[PDB]
């Protein structure tokens, strides 16, 4: 509300409230947080990224995006909690402090603004973007199947009306291209994490191919460690492994793209729960979900630094 200290972290918010939150956080911690606009959505909404940094020039960075699939509300809520957490733990938590003293963190809380606004206004379960094409009456593209990584291959639909439609061509969605352009221009990201829900899974590349990544041993142990850390708070059990062997083949995914760009620590989190509530996770589970997920994300960050 008037302060990030009065903001209700235990309830779901609208796009405007989340955008207001960002400005409050920056005004309160001008020396640590800055708000960057990396593009505009299909419907003209600004796409914001929060940069957490103690200084330096183009220091090694960590990318974290949430809400690429709009109906996965627990992600945007966790993103807001993360933003506040970073400001409270710097200078308090020895490990997190060391990380921020040497690396920058870029956080995109609402990766798909138009879809998010739509889930509040018309369809709570909408997941795609809101782009339109003359070739069909259906709207939107599955932003996590629109990346240039096995684009168009099995594990995505070529039908505009499909919930997993990949789009006319790779990076056709401005919400995706905005991230691609930013990360390529930056050129110094070491980790790339994309947050989703639900299933309680921690996955690494690849999803579009059966080929094993050359860093499988390391990423597999990092995942095992992150999952153990996350489970330590409430006993929440996660499974981990490559996308294709844990779930199924899926093309045009973001971490497959990032890994091919040379960003070794690329992981995807699928948060609570396992189906009881699914995408409609109770607000009472926001904080405990964010708390445990933080332990997992920090573990990965520690291995990155």
CATH number of the CATH domain containing 117: 3.40.630.10
Rounded distance between C-alpha atoms, residue 195 and residue 198, angstroms: 10
Using CA atoms of 106, 112, 113, 119 in order, give the dihedral in degrees to the nearest 10. Answer: -130
Determine whether 43 is an active site residue: no
Rounded distance between C-alpha atoms, residue 272 and residue 281, angstroms: 8
Q: Which two tokens stand for residue 25?
A: 């956080």
223: left (phi over 0), alpha (psi -120 to 50) or beta: alpha
Q: What angle do CA 259, 263, 267 make, to 5 degrees?
A: 65
- Element spanning 268, H or E: strand 265-271
Neighbouring CB atoms inside 10 A of 294's CB total: 20
147 with 170: CB under 8 angstroms? yes
151 with 177: CB under 8 angstroms? no
181 with 162: CB under 8 angstroms? no
The three-class DSSP label of residue 279 is helix
Q: Is 208 annotated as a binding residue?
A: no
Active-site pick, 173, 175, 270, 292: 270
CA-nearest of 103, 97, 98, 92 to 64 is 103
Resolution in A: 1.8
Q: Is 303 annotated as a binding residue?
A: no
Maximal C-alpha separation, the chain: 55
142 with 71: CB under 8 angstroms? no
- Element spanning 241, H or E: strand 239-242
Rounded distance between C-alpha atoms, residue 264 and residue 281, angstroms: 31
Q: Is 71 annotated as a binding residue?
A: yes
Q: Is 218 annotated as a binding residue?
A: no
203 with 267: CB under 8 angstroms? yes
In the chain, count of helices (H) and strands (E)? 9, 8
Strand partners for 104: 61
Rounded distance between C-alpha atoms, residue 268 and residue 192, angstroms: 9
Residue listed under structure tokens 């920058």: 104
The three-class DSSP label of residue 197 is strand
Q: Which two tokens stand for residue 198?
A: 């639900």
Q: Is 124 annotated as a binding residue?
A: no
Rounded distance between C-alpha atoms, residue 88 and residue 77, angstroms: 17
What domain range is 238 assigned to? 1-305
The three-class DSSP label of residue 148 is coil
164 with 210: CB under 8 angstroms? no
CA-nearest of 305, 298, 304 to 93 is 298
User: CA separation (Å) from 40 to 51, 129, 134, 175, 187?
Assistant: 18, 13, 21, 7, 22
Q: Is 70 annotated as a binding residue?
A: yes
| Number of domains, the chain | 1
267 with 300: CB under 8 angstroms? yes
Q: What angle do CA 236, 74, 172 make, to 5 degrees?
A: 120
Strand partners for 197: 271
User: CA separation (Å) from 140 to 31, 168, 296?
Assistant: 38, 11, 32
Q: CA end-to-end span of the chain, whole Å?
A: 35
Residue 213 per-residue DSSP state: P
Q: Is 145 annotated as a binding residue?
A: yes
Q: Which two tokens stand for residue 83?
A: 């933003």
Residue listed under structure tokens 């609208």: 14
């Amino acid at each position: 509300a008037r302060s990030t200290n009065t903001f209700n972290y235990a309830t779901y918010h609208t796009l405007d409230e989340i955008y207001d939150f960002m400005d409050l956080l920056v005004a309160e911690h001008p020396q640590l947080v800055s708000k960057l606009q990396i593009g505009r959505s299909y419907e003209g909404r600004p796409i914001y990224v929060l940069k957490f940094s103690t200084g330096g020039s183009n220091r090694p960075a960590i990318w974290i995006d949430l809400g690429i699939h709009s109906r996965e509300w627990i992600t945007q809520a966790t993103g807001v909690w993360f933003a506040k957490k970073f400001t409270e733990d710097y200078g308090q938590d020895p490990s997190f402090t060391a990380i921020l003293d040497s690396m920058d963190i870029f956080l995109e809380i609402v990766t798909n603004p138009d879809g998010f606004a739509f889930t509040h206004s018309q369809n709570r379960l909408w997941r795609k973007t809101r782009s339109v094409t003359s070739s069909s009456l259906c709207v939107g593209v599955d932003a996590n199947r629109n990346w240039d990584a096995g684009f168009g291959k099995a594990g995505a639909s070529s039908s505009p009306c499909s919930e997993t439609y990949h789009g006319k061509y790779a990076n056709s969605e401005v919400e995706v291209k905005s991230i691609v352009d930013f990360v390529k221009d930056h050129g110094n990201f070491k980790a790339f994490l994309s947050i989703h829900s639900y299933s309680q899974l921690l996955l690494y590349p690849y999803g579009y191919t059966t080929q094993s990544i050359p860093d499988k041993t390391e990423l597999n142990q990092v995942a095992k460690s992150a999952v153990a850390a996350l489970k330590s708070l409430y006993g929440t059990s996660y499974k981990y492994g490559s996308i294709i062997t844990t779930i199924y083949q899926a093309s045009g995914g973001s971490i497959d793209w990032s890994y091919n760009q040379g960003i070794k620590y690329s992981f995807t989190f699928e948060l609570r729960d396992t189906g009881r509530y699914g995408f409609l996770l109770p607000a009472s589970q926001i904080i405990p979900t964010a708390q445990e997920t933080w332990l997992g994300v920090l573990t990965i960050m520690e291995h990155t630094v």
